[PDB]
A paper describes a structure:
[name] is one of the [name]-associating components and contains a histone-fold DNA-binding domain.
Owing to its high resolution, 169 residues and 249 solvent molecules were placed. However, under these conditions [name] retained its complexed form.
Residue numbers in the entry:
A (entry chain B), C (entry chain B): 7 to 101
B (entry chain C), D (entry chain C): 7 to 80
């Protein structure tokens, strides 16, 4: 049904982006990622997006908000100083 | 790498509360976070293949790097 | 100095509790945990307490609070339905 | 397993803000969470040793179960 087809379309979109990003790493490092490997990274990313989504929803709610903001995204990166610095850079760039 | 509209649809797939929405800032930052995650997965798996003297990256290389990858992203 | 000795005392306290809890698992399962293994589990627990502490502090702050409450602890367990159910049971028991 | 006073001292060792305190409910729940964490580490390492036909649990058994343990506790 509609939700199954939506999931397929979203997995396909993640897979397309994953292959593009992997190709860039491949050219830099002199490796090639097999089709099976690209599909595996894409599925891991699709599943990781669920963990992120559920965390963001709970983090916003913990602050009594229904709308997820940059503050919630920064909280996802809290354990890695380098990731938090990178996300904060991207947030500070926005108008 | 990821479009904001795709990120929104991905996140909305998993929200358990019907009230939940995501602002534009957060969608952009999530697109950036997802891109970093994919790039890290690929780069780490590539380095693992290289350490095993293989030019082709296989699922086994992804599996080897996956636990620390997930731990590094919480 | 004082902080180094404090860290030693807290590692010793965690180690004592870890050995007690491991002995209970050992008797149930018919294994024995070597001294090295008990020390390893204790050090992992000491390090994991840092991740918990830093998360609790940030979770309370995300809600504009300086005092960490049961709501912040529940948020630590959010990804495991069974852990959240267990923590919620223990919280509901309190007067 | 863990005393509330020990848990408070452990957590206060790592707080980065001087304003941070922890209420009694949270200390009790954290003692319970730490106890579950230790019991899980021990039980999982024991099952791994058993699967390798060893009655004595070694650091290698802890190391094998550690990544999924940490992933299960976030």
């Amino acid at each position: 049904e509609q939700r199954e087809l939506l999931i397929q379309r979203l997995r396909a979109a993640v897979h397309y982006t994953t292959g593009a990003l992997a190709q860039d790493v491949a050219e830099d490092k002199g490796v090639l990622f097999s089709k099976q490997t690209v599909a595996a990274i894409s599925e891991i990313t699709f599943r990781q997006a669920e963990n992120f989504a559920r965390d963001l929803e709970m983090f916003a709610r913990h602050a009594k908000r229904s709308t997820i903001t940059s503050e919630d995204v920064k909280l996802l990166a809290r354990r890695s100083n380098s990731l938090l610095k990178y996300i904060t850079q991207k947030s500070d760039e926005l108008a | 790498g990821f479009r904001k509209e795709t990120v929104e649809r991905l996140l909305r797939l998993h929200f358990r509360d019907g009230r939940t929405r995501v602002n534009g800032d957060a969608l952009l930052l999530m697109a950036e976070l997802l891109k970093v995650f994919v790039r890290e997965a690929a780069a780490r798996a590539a380095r693992q293949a290289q350490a095993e003297d293989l030019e082709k990256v296989d699922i086994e290389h992804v599996e080897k790097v996956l636990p620390q990858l997930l731990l590094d992203f919480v």
